[PDB]
């Protein structure tokens, strides 16, 4: 049903395509750095701290996620 509809409504993006402008993503350099927006008029401070992760495809995203689960998450409304 779905494949029929895709030929029914999405066909008409061929004829001739790409060729002249092939746009592949270049890698993005991670920098160990700090951004500090001091604002004492805001009631509570927000901090986000991160190292460079490996990316979508890497098999060891599973193992990192397990450790991230061990640390987990908290919230003042949690019963625990």
């Amino acid at each position: 049903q779905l494949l029929d509809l895709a030929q029914k409504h999405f066909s008409g993006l061929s004829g001739t395509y790409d060729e002249d402008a092939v746009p592949t993503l270049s890698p993005c350099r991670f920098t160990g750095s700090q951004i500090c927006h001091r604002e004492d008029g805001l009631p509570l401070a927000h901090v986000a701290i991160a190292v460079e992760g490996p990316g979508w495809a890497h098999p060891d995203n599973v193992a990192l996620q397990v450790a991230n689960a061990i640390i987990g998450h908290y919230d003042c409304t949690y019963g625990g």
Binding site: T31, G32, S33, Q34, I35, C36, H37, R38, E39, D40, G41
Partner: protein, 75 residues
């Protein structure tokens, strides 16, 4: 004694910093450095030097006058 978080009120100031492992310790050591030392020598030679140059003259004359005082040409 005061600690961080109790010092003062500061608002709307962003500080961008780099890791010491991403940046060089001596960026332009001689190229930026040499002009800078000359600049702050120039900024202060008129306040630091004129008392020392004055001491040097009071020292050079004083030592000279001490030697040529005991000796005498007539009896």
């Amino acid at each position: 004694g005061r600690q961080f978080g109790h010092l003062t009120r500061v608002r709307h100031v962003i500080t961008y910093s780099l890791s010491p492992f991403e940046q060089r310790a001596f960026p332009h050591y001689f190229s930026k450095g040499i002009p800078n030392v000359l600049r702050r020598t120039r900024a202060c030679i008129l306040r630091v030097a004129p008392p020392f140059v004055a001491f040097y003259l009071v020292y050079t004359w004083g030592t000279q006058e001490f030697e040529k005082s005991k000796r005498k040409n007539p009896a």
